Symmetry: C3
Subunit: 419 residues, 3 copies
Amino acid sequence: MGLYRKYIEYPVLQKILIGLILGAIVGLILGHYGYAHAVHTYVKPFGDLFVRLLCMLVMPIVFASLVVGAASISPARLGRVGVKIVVYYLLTSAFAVTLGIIMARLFNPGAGIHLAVGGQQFQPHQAPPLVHILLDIVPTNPFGALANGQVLPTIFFAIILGIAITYLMNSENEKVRKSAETLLDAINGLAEAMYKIVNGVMQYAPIGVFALIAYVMAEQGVHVVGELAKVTAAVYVGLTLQILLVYFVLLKIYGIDPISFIKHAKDAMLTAFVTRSSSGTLPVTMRVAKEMGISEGIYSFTLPLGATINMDGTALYQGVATFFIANALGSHLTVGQQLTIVLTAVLASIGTAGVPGAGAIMLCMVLHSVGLPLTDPNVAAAYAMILGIDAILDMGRTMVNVTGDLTGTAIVAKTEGTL
Amino acid sequence: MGLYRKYIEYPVLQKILIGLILGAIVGLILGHYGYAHAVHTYVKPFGDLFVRLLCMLVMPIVFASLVVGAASISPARLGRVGVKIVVYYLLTSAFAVTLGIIMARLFNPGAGIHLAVGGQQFQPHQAPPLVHILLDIVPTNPFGALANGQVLPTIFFAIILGIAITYLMNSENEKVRKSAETLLDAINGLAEAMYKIVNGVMQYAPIGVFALIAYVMAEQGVHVVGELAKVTAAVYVGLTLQILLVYFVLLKIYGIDPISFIKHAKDAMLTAFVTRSSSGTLPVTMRVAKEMGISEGIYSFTLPLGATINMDGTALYQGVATFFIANALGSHLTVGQQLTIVLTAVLASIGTAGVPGAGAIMLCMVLHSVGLPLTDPNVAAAYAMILGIDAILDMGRTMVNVTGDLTGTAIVAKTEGTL
Amino acid sequence: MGLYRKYIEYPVLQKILIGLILGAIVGLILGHYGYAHAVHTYVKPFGDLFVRLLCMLVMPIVFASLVVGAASISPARLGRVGVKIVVYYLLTSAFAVTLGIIMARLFNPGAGIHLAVGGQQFQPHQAPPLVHILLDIVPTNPFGALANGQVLPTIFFAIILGIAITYLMNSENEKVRKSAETLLDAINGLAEAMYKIVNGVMQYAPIGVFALIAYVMAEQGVHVVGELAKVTAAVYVGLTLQILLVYFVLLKIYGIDPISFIKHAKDAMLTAFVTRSSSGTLPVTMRVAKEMGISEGIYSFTLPLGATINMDGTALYQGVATFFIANALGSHLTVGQQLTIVLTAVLASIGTAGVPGAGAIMLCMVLHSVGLPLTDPNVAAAYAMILGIDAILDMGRTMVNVTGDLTGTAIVAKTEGTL
Ligand SMILES: CCCCCCCC/C=C/CCCCCCCC(=O)O[C@H](COC(=O)CCCCCCCCCCCCCCC)COP(=O)(O)OCCN
Ligand SMILES: CCCCCCCC/C=C/CCCCCCCC(=O)O[C@H](COC(=O)CCCCCCCCCCCCCCC)COP(=O)(O)OCCN
Ligand SMILES: CCCCCCCC/C=C/CCCCCCCC(=O)O[C@H](COC(=O)CCCCCCCCCCCCCCC)COP(=O)(O)OCCN
Ligand SMILES: N[C@@H](CC(=O)O)C(=O)O
Ligand SMILES: N[C@@H](CC(=O)O)C(=O)O
Ligand SMILES: N[C@@H](CC(=O)O)C(=O)O
Ligand SMILES: [Hg+2]
Ligand SMILES: [Hg+2]
Ligand SMILES: [Hg+2]
Ligand code: NA
Ligand code: NA
Ligand code: NA
Ligand code: NA
Ligand code: NA
Ligand code: NA
Ligand code: NA
Ligand code: NA
Ligand code: NA
C-alpha cells in the first residue's frame, strides 16, 4: 500500500494528461494492427465504469445543488446589491451559452464522426405539442420524477422548494424556523457529500480517460484527433470572445479600464487555470478584489455567491458539447430544442459544483433535457470522446468562471460607489 | 413590476370570487356563440396548470404531514387529557364524514353531468379479494410506494414511522434522542415548506379558477350552475346539521349551554369564515376560550393540537365531493368503497394543512384510495368543476373546523373540572 | 385493554416458543383430518401479514444502517486500534459465512421439501455476463435503485455516501461540518426508527409464527419437522465449530488461554443466549472485559463498535439459510453466486441491527442479491419455514456474536500491550 500513496499524492492534472497521451498512442497502435476487438473486450469496461460513476452522480446533484442554489438567489433574502449581481449573473450565463451556440455553429464539431455503434443510426424522438411540453415541467409526483430520470420536473420542484424554505426561514415561529434550518442543512450536507464523491471519482479518472480514448482511437480511427481539435478550438475561441467582447464591453461602459483590470486579475486567473477549481481560487480572488480598491462589503458577498452561481465557461462548454454530440450522431437540433439548451445550460452552470471535472456531469442534464438520453449506445459513444478531453477544456472553463465573478464585483461596486 | 405588487396585495378571496364570476360569464358567452374549441385550445391550459400544481403537492404532504401528525397523537407522549381529546377528535371526524355521505345521498350532486370526455364513459376497475386488499396496505417497499402513487401504503408507513420516532424520543441514549429529534425536525420542515408552496399556488388560483370554469361553462353548458348549486347546498346543509346535531347534543349532554357557547365563539367563527384559515384564527380561538372560563392548562394544549388534527368540515366536504365526482361519471359507489371514504377522509382531514385551499389537495388522496385516479381524463374533468367552487365551501369548512376545536375544549374542560 | 397489557408484558421468547409448539400441533392435527384448505383460507393471512411486515423493513435498514455503519468503519476517522479491529471483524465474518457454506454442504438442509406451490417449479434466472454484472453495482440513479428493489446498487451508494460524510466532518468550514453532522444525524435517526419498528413487529411475531408453521405443517406434512431439525443441527454445529476452531486457534496463537477466557465470558454469553440482543448485553460485555484485565481505552471503543459490526453468527446463519432456501426449491447454487453469498452475508451481518429477530430481515438482502426474489411464491413459501424457527437459532446466533467481540478485544489488547 505504498504504491497507492505514490499514485494518490501525484498531481491529478498531470495524471490525466499522461493517461490521455498514453491512451492515444496505445489505441492508435493497437487499432492499426487489427486488435480493435481486444481493446473493446478488455480495456473498454474500465472506461464504462468511469462513465457509469459520473452518470451516478447526476440526479442528487441536480436536486440538492439547485435547492441550495435557489435558496441563495431567493427574493426573500436578496437585498439591493444582490438583485444587481443576480441579474448580471443570469444575463451573462445566457449570453455565454448563446455565444457557445454561435461558436459551435461557425465550426462544425463532430461532422465526420458518423456513428453506427450497433449497425443502426440515431432515431430522434418525436416531440409532443408545446402545451404538453410546457405542462410536463410540473410533475404529478416529485418522488416519481426523482425515481425516473425526468430532470426538468426535478429542477422546477427543487427551485420552488428552495424558495419556500427561504420564505420559511424568516417566519415568526421558532419551531418552523428551526425545522426549515435543519431541512436546508440536511440538503446542503447531501450536496457537499456528492461533491466529495466527485473528488473521489476524479482520482480514478486517469484510468477512465485512458480506457475511454484508447478504445475511441482504436475503434473510430485517427481522424477523431482532428475532430476533437475542432471542439477544443471552438471552446477556446468561444471563451476568448466571451472574455473580450462581453467583459471588455461591460467594463468600458461602466468606466472601468479593462487592461488594468486584467493586470490586476492575472494572479486569480492563472490560479483558476492551473487548479481547475473555483472554490480553491476564492481566497486569491478575494485578495485580488481587495487589491483593486473594491470595498469589503461588496466582495465579501458577491464573490462567494459568484463562486457557485456564475459559471460562464461551463455554460459555453455545455452549449458547444451539446452541439458536438448532436453533430456526431447526424442529428440536427431544431429551433425550440436550441432554446432549451440556452435555458438548461444556464441551469446546469448554476447547478455545477466548482470542483475539477464537474461540468461533464451536468452536461448529462442538458443532454437529457433535449432528447439525447445516455442510455442510448450512440449518445453514450459520443459522450465518451467529449469526456476524454475534459481536462483540456476545464482550465479555460474555470478561468472564465473566475473572471466573470471579478467583472461583476467591479461593475456592481462601481455602480454602488456613486452614492 | 408595479402591477405585480398591485395584484399580490389584493385580497385573495375577493380575487378568486371575481375570477369565478368573470369565468362564468365569459364561458357562457363564448359557449353560446359556438367558440367552445377556442377556449379549449387557449384558456384551458391555464387551468390545467392549476390542477397540475395542486396535484404536485399531494404525496409530500401525505407523507410528511401524517408523520408529524402521528407524532403528536402518539401514545408514548399522550397524557390523560390527550387521550380524551384524541378520542373526541377521531369520533367527530368519523361522524362528520358519515353525515357528509348521508347529505350527499339525500341530494343527488352530479347526476346530470354525464361525462364522455373522449367519447368514452368511465369503466370502474375490478377489485381484488378483501384479503389481498387488506394485505396491500403494508408495502413491500416504502420508497416504491412513494415513487408510485400508492397512498394507502404511504399512510401506513408514515403513521408507524411517526410512532417509532416518538418512542425513540424518550430513550435513555443521548445520540439516539438527538437523531430522532433532527429526523422529526427535517420531516416537519418539509411539511411546512409544502404548505408554503400551497400558499404560493393559491395566489395563481384566480387565473386557474377562471380558466377552469370558463371551459366548464363553455363545454358542459348552463345546467352545471344548477348542478354545482346542489353541491353547495349539500355541503352547507351538512355543515349546519354537523354543528346543530353533533355539537349541540354533545354540549347538552355535558351540561354546557349551547346558546351561550355560540354567543361566546362568534368572534372566532366569523374570523374562520372570512379568513379561511385555522392557523391564523388560533389567537382568536385561544382568546375566546380564555373568555369562556376554560383553564389555561387545557386550552394551551387542546387548541393548537385541534388546529391541525380536528377538521370536521374538511371530512364532510371530502365525503360530499367524492360522492359528487362518482355521480358525475355515472359510477355507483358500492358498500366497502363507501367505508373506505369514511376511513380515508378522516385520514385526509388529519393530513390537511389548515391554510386556505388545502382540502381540495387532500381530496386527491380520497379519490385515489377508492379507485378514481386523476390521470383518467373523466376524473380530471369532474375534479375541475369541484375545484372551481372551492372558495365558496372553504369558508363554512373552516368555520366548522374551528367550532369543533372549541366544542372539544369545552367538553374536556367540563369533564376535568369535576375534580 | 387489560388483556393487551397481559399480552405485551409477557416474555417474548416464551411467547414465540408456545406459539411455535401450538402451531405445530394444531397444524398437524388439522392437516391429518383433511382441513388443509381451511387453514390456507383463514390462518395463512395472519402469517402473510408477518412476512409482509418483515419485508417492509428491508430497504430503509439496508440504506441507513449501512450509511451509519460505513461512517464508523471509515478510514478518515479510523486510528491504529481501529484498523486492527476492522481487519479482524471483516476476516472473521468472511470465515463465518464460509464455515456456514461448508456446514450447509455437509448436511443437506431442505433436500426433500420439493416445492410446487402453484403446480410449477422454480425457474432460475439467466445471468448476464460478468462485466455487466460488475457494472450494474454502480447505479445510473440512486433514487431509482431505492424505488425498485436493487439492493446491490443501494449498498454501494450507501457505503460511498457514508465515507463522503466522514470526509466532510473533518473539514475546515463550519457550515460544511454542521451540514454533514445533521445529515448523518438524520440518517441515524431513520436507522434507529426502523429498529423500533422491528421491536414492534416482534411483539406480533408469536401470532405470525403460529399462522406460518401451522400452514407449513398442514400443507407440507410431517417430514418438515425432520427437515428443519437438520437446519437447526447445521446452524448449531456451525456455531460450535466457529467458536472452537476460529476463536480457540486465534487465542492460542496470541498467547491467550481459551479456557479461562470462556470461564470469564460465560456471564456475557449466557445473557446473549437468553436475551437474543447484542445491544442489551453491552454493559455485561464491558463488565466482563473489565474483569479480564483489558484496559479501558481498548474496550471502551472496540466493544460498542463490535456490537453492531461484528456478527459472525448472523453471517453463518444467513449462509446456511440461503443454502436451505435454494435446496428447498431444487436449485443448485453455482460457483459465482456462492461467492456472492460470502460478500453479501458479510454486508448483511454489518447491516443487521442487534435487536431480537433482525437477521431474518437481512436474509432478504442475501436472497435478493443471488437471484431468489421473495415476490416469487416458491421463495416466499421456502422463507416462511425458515422464518418460523428463527427464535431457536437467534439465541446461539447472538451468543457467537458477543463472543466474537470479546475475542477481538482480547486479541487486540494483547497486541497493543506489548509496548
Ligand atoms: C487498475 C484498477 C481498475 C479497477 C479500479 C476500480 C476502482 C473503482 C472506483 C471507485 C471510485 C469511488 C470513489 C469513492 C468516493 C468516496 C471517497 C471520498 O469521498 O474521499 C476521497 C478519496 O479519494 C480517493 O482516493 C478514492 C479512491 C478512488 C480510486 C483511486 C485508485 C484508482 C484505482 C486503483 C489504481 C491505483 C492503485 C495503486 C496502483 C499504483 C477524497 O479525496 P481527496 O480529493 O484527496 O480529498 C482530500 C480529503 N481531505
Ligand atoms: C397570465 C399568467 C399565466 C401564466 C402564469 C404562470 C404562473 C405559474 C405559477 C407558479 C406558482 C408557483 C408558486 C411558488 C411557490 C413558492 C413561493 C412561496 O412559497 O412564497 C409565496 C409567494 O407567493 C407568490 O407570490 C408566488 C407567485 C404565484 C403567482 C403569482 C402571479 C400570478 C400569475 C401572473 C399574473 C399577475 C402578474 C402581474 C399582472 C397584474 C408566499 O406568499 P404569501 O402567501 O403572501 O406569504 C407571505 C410571506 N411572508
Ligand atoms: C389476533 C390479531 C391478528 C391481527 C392483528 C394485526 C396487528 C398488525 C401488526 C402491527 C405491528 C406494527 C408495529 C408498530 C411499530 C411502531 C410501534 C413501536 O415502535 O413501539 C413498540 C411497541 O410495540 C407494540 O406493542 C406494537 C404492537 C404490536 C402488536 C401487538 C398486539 C398483537 C396483535 C393483537 C393480539 C393481542 C391483543 C390482546 C389479546 C390478548 C415498542 O415496543 P417495546 O419493544 O416494548 O419498546 C419499549 C418502549 N420503551
Ligand atoms: N472546474 C469548474 C467547474 C466545471 O466547469 O466543471 C470550476 O471550478 O469552475
Ligand atoms: N381552510 C381549511 C382547510 C381546508 O379544508 O382546506 C382550514 O384552515 O381549516
Ligand atoms: N439477535 C442478533 C441479531 C440477529 O442475528 O438477528 C443479535 O442481537 O446479535
Ligand atoms: Hg456523466
Ligand atoms: Hg389536486
Ligand atoms: Hg423478511
Ligand atoms: Na453568468
Ligand atoms: Na455552479
Ligand atoms: Na465563477
Ligand atoms: Na373531528
Ligand atoms: Na388537518
Ligand atoms: Na380545527
Ligand atoms: Na466477524
Ligand atoms: Na450488525
Ligand atoms: Na457482536
